[PDB]
């Protein structure tokens, strides 16, 4: 049969199989890593010579040593097929090659392996002699691919080539050294010269064969087009499978070659429509023809449905479920609990407000400057100071009283006129009106002028009084109308208002009081900071209730004022209140001193939870020797909770925090407490202080005073349990905790690091339990009981396992608001659906840990990929899958227009010689007469281009290849040239996308690997790179002038501890996803966009052998026509390898330079299913980011074009401050008018007076383009317009024309373009360049126009033709 074979290979050589197997096996469990490292250092894996034998040996070992069970072994095989660990090993090599070798000066001979201790290299295990002092930049920085074994003050690193036997003795020297406790052990890799430099063959991608002619509709030669009765295709296709009775295989066989089976459907009483019944299924949940996947309730987006994305999900999910099923729950019961209604409700219901302590007490009464006092003002003197005034009657206005009950504190900036106006007009009227509210205001101090004016007003209050200070403010607003202190205005106030300033005497003239400037201003700053009452939008506090200063905040205030009054009334009727009481303190009962703090973060996503069962399984050695206070024997399930405190007992804050936890435990009988001592200094063993407390464990919480706890720590003589020390440092590494840092863990949730123990007091534990209890514990308890699993909770630790697992289930791997429509809410509404005639299951439900629910539409192209991947994941043991087929009756056009193959295996395949088999996409029995297009359906982080192919992948036909090459078999090889580093930026603290910011990617070898600019949409940016250690620096210039980037969010959205870094490392086939943070430098509202290679640069794109042949002619015409230097730029992925291999020969002959450029289409940006449309988008959407920043300007020339001009003239053409220049449509042809569609309603109404331009030739002043941020506007307008499919006929032409109102377009002389179709023959004498624009009444081909229209076209073609033969010979 005539076949097509496609294979993909990586841009880095294949690492040794041995090292790949220990990396795949030990994902991040270090115990399995070093336990296997021992085995190979024995010389145990030396007797296995072939990859198959080596692989075979690992299976026996893992099973025998208890590392893996059937479920985990099956998962290991699939991940090993995927070759997931290969980029992780290459990271070591790139790091070693670029940072180790240039920092290790000297002559290396015999130093294959060497430890690095105190910046000294030792080539021998005996450690007697040191070769050198390794350069400055410290290699002791712990980075992503590192592993640590044991605890030790000294840090030792071994760079080894594991392959040879020379490794074994070196390892044992440091393994034992770590076992003793002298130093902590870690292994780094060295590129092994025993292995060959063969490239790596990859899998986990898909190949598509797209039909490029779909117009026809009314073994295989061509698909037979049938009369347009498309409507039943999905419905009949679904039945075919149900009938088969081997349904999974049928769907795969049908869905892969679907276009070929279209006419074969609808035959022999085909419908069998019993499943018209299952549209009762449609009537309750999903619309017809929609593809939806669930993994234990989790709704997955399309990006997560690849082999890599799915393997990582199972890994995380199993850890979660296994933890649950150790309490006697079936996998089925466990999943049902995770996706329960009460659980999802809690995530939705975690948005409630509270009150905060607005008082002066902390700042010793020197920050709030009140305009009122209702108890002593001689305005309210007439009114009654009675409680019953509030409680009784009241109309609709406000009840008058002489008492302190309602307060309002508003922070005001004295530099800003609008802010000052609020106090003078707003606040004062309320005073005069005798409103029963006390009005206060605190100045904001963000600038120098503001600081001074706070001093001025504060001083004026202190000696002279409120009215005098008031007077300065009033006068300043009307009289001077600016913030800055005015003495011309100030002195007038003192002139009259300076009468008898009582109390402490006046000082006058200049203020720099050590107390007044320092204490008052810094105390004010302490109040604003404490309650986060400043920034872009300040915060007003009414009765401790935050109301941001926006819109009509007084309307919001009045609503709470009435609601607080009704709250006082009800307490009065119950007799709670008395005449001797401070009424404002009724609200302050549950108020917190600090607003935000790690417990109630304003960023709702900021949260970290750990698997509790995991904590007591991995660290059993540690957690069975920690001081434990069991929760009371006679307490209720609702009262139950588990708390663990991590603290540095060698610091006051560390031991203070534990005293508060012990205090809290005395009060709450239901809590079960654990104490973990985490010290900063490793000189003394951590086990001693833990042993001191476990002896006093019985006597715990009998500490009348704090000293009793302090003394207990110091007394006693103990023997260091070094086994305890080892499990302790493993716990911190697993939990991402630094040494000497304080943390608090209630039911898995971590808060910290605690810098000061005053932040977390006994009262803070009580609210932490109260809120945590509500959100996580109560929804678990209800849901659990609803299922009848409430027998399985046997204690506080037993309960924490369940609540901690369900909290981890609702934390997304992908932060909300950046990818697509799929939140972190596990649904269960598909369980209601009837399943008899649309569903089929694979795997045992009783034993399965993983439950997949796929809802696939057979007529969809997306379904083709889904089926192929799901079949391979179904082959895994312990996985259950259930499939639902839902087709649509709405089919206006052909449903599937392509053939599909997925390259993926569930277990590795081996050679006749035992080597690992490479994987390929082989299509057999391909129709001989159909024209096809080859496409790669590659994971989102991948950048792929064709490397080996002699055929036109854009125009494939077997009949032509047979008649030209003699073979019916086509083979093509692609290269995974780059892997993406992509991220989503944000400004700090007022989080906005910093657009126009420039970035530079670097390595220790070269400081300029790559460069890109930040986009407006999601602060998006990307880099093309391979495995290794990189760094991101802001480009020198305006970017570094305005900003400083605190972090690149390499761990997650965060901020997570340990991420205050600018280092990026890629060690995965999923690339690197980043969430960087940038904070503006001192007092800036600046913008980059506004100011405070070769002589000629031409770029183009071609999508066929003909268009590439025409592109060769275009470049040659330029060269013959200019006495200048030219550089050509190409869109890399749309070109053939035949063209790619030819250009150096064109460059040598014609004397030009060339560079390949590309950018991957963003995930947020709207895709193009039609390749020709993709190409058009590449010319207009990514102009600012496709070319390096160093390029001033570029010119686009179409492939079909020919140029007779010296192209420099276009560069020198004045653009009059416009970012890009285009040439207009020809008017010169007299009788062509009918086909001039840009004089019709839509185009003439829109283009009022502006021209209709041509995208065949144009100039882009790139520096101005980026400066104007034109690209962002093009992209968002495209995305918005693209919702309607008939929006842009030719987007390349239509987008600049639709944006010429918004973005200026410089218009070019029409000498710059000629086209026979629209320009007269007389015009061509003065023509500079010629486009071969379409017919449009005829079908004459481009080859015909070229020879007839231009006589020198053949001369150029002959030159290329003989050179191609000259190269071939
Ligand atoms: C990451 O990588 C690792 C790589 O190895 C993966 O593999 C796992 O490794 C760990 C070690 O790192 C293995 O851990 C085993 O833990 C057992 C714990 O079981 C005890 O505790 C439970 C608590 O619920 C209890 O139910 C059990 O009965 C059992 O016992 C306790 O019971 C009481 C309650 O705790 C307690 O009062 C009692 O004193 C007793 O504790 C004793 O044993 C403790 C063992 O650590 C010891 O610390 C105590 O001081 C006390 O002596 C543990 O029992 C296992 O030890 C085995 O190890 C040898 C192999 O069997 C054997 O020589 C030992 O004698 C001991 O045998 C005991 O268990 C068997 C039954 O299994 C029994 O027949 C014997 O009579 C003995 O009681 C291990 O230390 C773990 O097993 C590895 N596999 C798995 C599948 O987890 C790890 O999985 C990777 N991570 C992930 C996420 O995959
Ligand atoms: C007026 O009303 C209050 C109601 O709030 C009456 O109760 C007493 O109020 C005081 C506070 O003003 C309470 O003191 C507090 O006690 C707790 C412990 O319960 C302690 O933690 C606090 O630090 C503070 O000391 C007091 O307990 C409370 N009850 C009694 C019996 O005094 C108050 O009695 C009323 N006034 C009169 C004179 O009746
Ligand atoms: C690229 O550069 C070359 C060199 O400057 C340009 O060549 C030009 O071609 C004309 C052909 O008639 C030259 O004229 C001849 O000069 C010789 C000098 O010995 C003389 O003997 C002949 O009788 C005749 O006059 C001319 O010198 C030369 N330079 C210029 C400036 O015209 C070539 O045209 C350039 N290409 C393009 C497209 O501009
Ligand atoms: C369809 O198949 C055969 C065709 O002859 C017929 O005997 C049978 O009754 C039909 N069944 C249905 C359900 O239409
Ligand atoms: C499922 O089928 C039964 C058949 O009796 C029907 O009563 C029920 O309403 C159906 N439910 C759905 C959701 O289709
Ligand atoms: Tb002491
Ligand atoms: Tb303290
Ligand atoms: Tb053209």
PDB file of C-alpha atoms in Angstrom, residues 50-179:
ATOM      1  CA  UNK A  50      21.559  -3.636  26.252  1.00  0.00           C
ATOM      2  CA  UNK A  51      18.811  -1.080  26.845  1.00  0.00           C
ATOM      3  CA  UNK A  52      16.172  -3.846  26.888  1.00  0.00           C
ATOM      4  CA  UNK A  53      18.137  -5.885  29.493  1.00  0.00           C
ATOM      5  CA  UNK A  54      18.754  -2.702  31.527  1.00  0.00           C
ATOM      6  CA  UNK A  55      15.040  -1.841  31.394  1.00  0.00           C
ATOM      7  CA  UNK A  56      14.162  -5.474  32.272  1.00  0.00           C
ATOM      8  CA  UNK A  57      16.472  -5.333  35.311  1.00  0.00           C
ATOM      9  CA  UNK A  58      14.827  -2.149  36.684  1.00  0.00           C
ATOM     10  CA  UNK A  59      11.348  -3.822  36.737  1.00  0.00           C
ATOM     11  CA  UNK A  60      12.575  -6.694  38.984  1.00  0.00           C
ATOM     12  CA  UNK A  61      14.501  -4.265  41.273  1.00  0.00           C
ATOM     13  CA  UNK A  62      11.623  -1.759  41.784  1.00  0.00           C
ATOM     14  CA  UNK A  63       9.123  -4.591  42.516  1.00  0.00           C
ATOM     15  CA  UNK A  64      11.571  -6.423  44.843  1.00  0.00           C
ATOM     16  CA  UNK A  65      12.606  -3.339  46.858  1.00  0.00           C
ATOM     17  CA  UNK A  66       8.969  -2.176  47.348  1.00  0.00           C
ATOM     18  CA  UNK A  67       9.395   1.026  45.298  1.00  0.00           C
ATOM     19  CA  UNK A  68       6.498   0.404  42.890  1.00  0.00           C
ATOM     20  CA  UNK A  69       3.281  -1.606  42.815  1.00  0.00           C
ATOM     21  CA  UNK A  70       1.455  -2.711  39.544  1.00  0.00           C
ATOM     22  CA  UNK A  71      -0.235   0.738  39.250  1.00  0.00           C
ATOM     23  CA  UNK A  72       3.052   2.679  39.617  1.00  0.00           C
ATOM     24  CA  UNK A  73       5.051   0.243  37.438  1.00  0.00           C
ATOM     25  CA  UNK A  74       2.536   0.685  34.567  1.00  0.00           C
ATOM     26  CA  UNK A  75       2.850   4.491  34.938  1.00  0.00           C
ATOM     27  CA  UNK A  76       6.675   4.188  34.861  1.00  0.00           C
ATOM     28  CA  UNK A  77       6.623   2.373  31.465  1.00  0.00           C
ATOM     29  CA  UNK A  78       4.470   5.098  29.799  1.00  0.00           C
ATOM     30  CA  UNK A  79       6.614   7.977  31.187  1.00  0.00           C
ATOM     31  CA  UNK A  80       9.753   6.070  30.062  1.00  0.00           C
ATOM     32  CA  UNK A  81       8.274   5.760  26.505  1.00  0.00           C
ATOM     33  CA  UNK A  82       7.595   9.531  26.547  1.00  0.00           C
ATOM     34  CA  UNK A  83      11.327  10.077  27.371  1.00  0.00           C
ATOM     35  CA  UNK A  84      10.268  12.694  29.980  1.00  0.00           C
ATOM     36  CA  UNK A  85      13.602  12.570  31.837  1.00  0.00           C
ATOM     37  CA  UNK A  86      15.864  13.276  28.798  1.00  0.00           C
ATOM     38  CA  UNK A  87      15.549  17.150  28.966  1.00  0.00           C
ATOM     39  CA  UNK A  88      16.181  16.978  32.771  1.00  0.00           C
ATOM     40  CA  UNK A  89      19.598  15.319  32.175  1.00  0.00           C
ATOM     41  CA  UNK A  90      20.487  17.747  29.324  1.00  0.00           C
ATOM     42  CA  UNK A  91      19.894  20.606  31.827  1.00  0.00           C
ATOM     43  CA  UNK A  92      22.890  19.282  33.850  1.00  0.00           C
ATOM     44  CA  UNK A  93      25.089  19.158  30.721  1.00  0.00           C
ATOM     45  CA  UNK A  94      24.230  22.672  29.505  1.00  0.00           C
ATOM     46  CA  UNK A  95      24.841  23.979  33.045  1.00  0.00           C
ATOM     47  CA  UNK A  96      28.153  22.069  33.231  1.00  0.00           C
ATOM     48  CA  UNK A  97      29.302  23.256  29.773  1.00  0.00           C
ATOM     49  CA  UNK A  98      28.346  26.946  30.253  1.00  0.00           C
ATOM     50  CA  UNK A  99      29.078  27.678  33.973  1.00  0.00           C
ATOM     51  CA  UNK A 100      31.364  24.894  35.379  1.00  0.00           C
ATOM     52  CA  UNK A 101      34.090  24.564  32.675  1.00  0.00           C
ATOM     53  CA  UNK A 102      34.826  28.363  32.266  1.00  0.00           C
ATOM     54  CA  UNK A 103      34.924  28.852  36.088  1.00  0.00           C
ATOM     55  CA  UNK A 104      37.325  25.887  36.670  1.00  0.00           C
ATOM     56  CA  UNK A 105      40.696  27.189  35.431  1.00  0.00           C
ATOM     57  CA  UNK A 106      43.618  24.789  34.979  1.00  0.00           C
ATOM     58  CA  UNK A 107      44.486  21.577  33.106  1.00  0.00           C
ATOM     59  CA  UNK A 108      42.102  18.630  33.543  1.00  0.00           C
ATOM     60  CA  UNK A 109      43.558  15.122  33.066  1.00  0.00           C
ATOM     61  CA  UNK A 110      42.311  12.194  35.153  1.00  0.00           C
ATOM     62  CA  UNK A 111      39.669  14.420  36.817  1.00  0.00           C
ATOM     63  CA  UNK A 112      36.664  12.639  35.257  1.00  0.00           C
ATOM     64  CA  UNK A 113      34.852  12.948  38.609  1.00  0.00           C
ATOM     65  CA  UNK A 114      35.522  15.558  41.325  1.00  0.00           C
ATOM     66  CA  UNK A 115      33.933  16.866  44.495  1.00  0.00           C
ATOM     67  CA  UNK A 116      33.666  20.615  45.047  1.00  0.00           C
ATOM     68  CA  UNK A 117      34.245  21.665  48.681  1.00  0.00           C
ATOM     69  CA  UNK A 118      34.747  25.311  49.850  1.00  0.00           C
ATOM     70  CA  UNK A 119      35.550  26.470  46.295  1.00  0.00           C
ATOM     71  CA  UNK A 120      38.206  23.735  46.055  1.00  0.00           C
ATOM     72  CA  UNK A 121      38.250  20.839  43.589  1.00  0.00           C
ATOM     73  CA  UNK A 122      39.325  17.312  44.684  1.00  0.00           C
ATOM     74  CA  UNK A 123      39.960  14.735  41.896  1.00  0.00           C
ATOM     75  CA  UNK A 124      40.458  11.935  44.482  1.00  0.00           C
ATOM     76  CA  UNK A 125      38.163  10.345  47.122  1.00  0.00           C
ATOM     77  CA  UNK A 126      41.099  10.372  49.632  1.00  0.00           C
ATOM     78  CA  UNK A 127      40.700  14.239  49.570  1.00  0.00           C
ATOM     79  CA  UNK A 128      44.388  15.086  50.334  1.00  0.00           C
ATOM     80  CA  UNK A 129      45.205  17.506  47.457  1.00  0.00           C
ATOM     81  CA  UNK A 130      43.149  20.418  45.950  1.00  0.00           C
ATOM     82  CA  UNK A 131      43.649  21.486  42.320  1.00  0.00           C
ATOM     83  CA  UNK A 132      41.969  24.911  42.361  1.00  0.00           C
ATOM     84  CA  UNK A 133      40.029  27.950  43.503  1.00  0.00           C
ATOM     85  CA  UNK A 134      36.841  28.017  41.400  1.00  0.00           C
ATOM     86  CA  UNK A 135      35.722  31.478  40.117  1.00  0.00           C
ATOM     87  CA  UNK A 136      33.458  33.894  42.075  1.00  0.00           C
ATOM     88  CA  UNK A 137      29.856  33.028  41.025  1.00  0.00           C
ATOM     89  CA  UNK A 138      28.861  30.430  43.655  1.00  0.00           C
ATOM     90  CA  UNK A 139      27.822  26.971  42.482  1.00  0.00           C
ATOM     91  CA  UNK A 140      26.352  26.168  45.972  1.00  0.00           C
ATOM     92  CA  UNK A 141      23.038  27.837  44.938  1.00  0.00           C
ATOM     93  CA  UNK A 142      20.328  25.158  45.155  1.00  0.00           C
ATOM     94  CA  UNK A 143      18.574  25.000  41.795  1.00  0.00           C
ATOM     95  CA  UNK A 144      15.531  23.046  40.392  1.00  0.00           C
ATOM     96  CA  UNK A 145      17.266  19.804  39.298  1.00  0.00           C
ATOM     97  CA  UNK A 146      19.242  19.371  42.563  1.00  0.00           C
ATOM     98  CA  UNK A 147      18.843  16.549  45.104  1.00  0.00           C
ATOM     99  CA  UNK A 148      20.093  16.502  48.706  1.00  0.00           C
ATOM    100  CA  UNK A 149      20.990  13.559  50.889  1.00  0.00           C
ATOM    101  CA  UNK A 150      21.431  14.140  54.601  1.00  0.00           C
ATOM    102  CA  UNK A 151      21.964  17.221  56.786  1.00  0.00           C
ATOM    103  CA  UNK A 152      25.387  18.764  57.174  1.00  0.00           C
ATOM    104  CA  UNK A 153      26.829  22.220  57.851  1.00  0.00           C
ATOM    105  CA  UNK A 154      29.344  21.711  55.054  1.00  0.00           C
ATOM    106  CA  UNK A 155      27.927  21.310  51.524  1.00  0.00           C
ATOM    107  CA  UNK A 156      29.518  18.797  49.136  1.00  0.00           C
ATOM    108  CA  UNK A 157      28.859  18.436  45.353  1.00  0.00           C
ATOM    109  CA  UNK A 158      30.049  15.526  43.122  1.00  0.00           C
ATOM    110  CA  UNK A 159      30.140  16.104  39.292  1.00  0.00           C
ATOM    111  CA  UNK A 160      30.138  12.567  37.945  1.00  0.00           C
ATOM    112  CA  UNK A 161      30.008  10.567  34.753  1.00  0.00           C
ATOM    113  CA  UNK A 162      27.976   7.662  36.141  1.00  0.00           C
ATOM    114  CA  UNK A 163      28.497   5.445  33.018  1.00  0.00           C
ATOM    115  CA  UNK A 164      32.067   4.377  33.949  1.00  0.00           C
ATOM    116  CA  UNK A 165      33.060   2.232  36.951  1.00  0.00           C
ATOM    117  CA  UNK A 166      35.438   5.074  38.142  1.00  0.00           C
ATOM    118  CA  UNK A 167      32.327   6.602  39.832  1.00  0.00           C
ATOM    119  CA  UNK A 168      31.509   3.896  42.509  1.00  0.00           C
ATOM    120  CA  UNK A 169      34.305   4.655  45.138  1.00  0.00           C
ATOM    121  CA  UNK A 170      33.779   8.481  45.031  1.00  0.00           C
ATOM    122  CA  UNK A 171      30.017   8.041  45.724  1.00  0.00           C
ATOM    123  CA  UNK A 172      30.522   5.780  48.797  1.00  0.00           C
ATOM    124  CA  UNK A 173      32.964   8.295  50.329  1.00  0.00           C
ATOM    125  CA  UNK A 174      30.262  11.002  50.447  1.00  0.00           C
ATOM    126  CA  UNK A 175      27.287   8.656  50.998  1.00  0.00           C
ATOM    127  CA  UNK A 176      28.839   7.512  54.328  1.00  0.00           C
ATOM    128  CA  UNK A 177      30.005  11.099  55.087  1.00  0.00           C
ATOM    129  CA  UNK A 178      26.333  12.202  54.772  1.00  0.00           C
ATOM    130  CA  UNK A 179      25.103   9.130  56.742  1.00  0.00           C
TER     131      UNK A 179
END
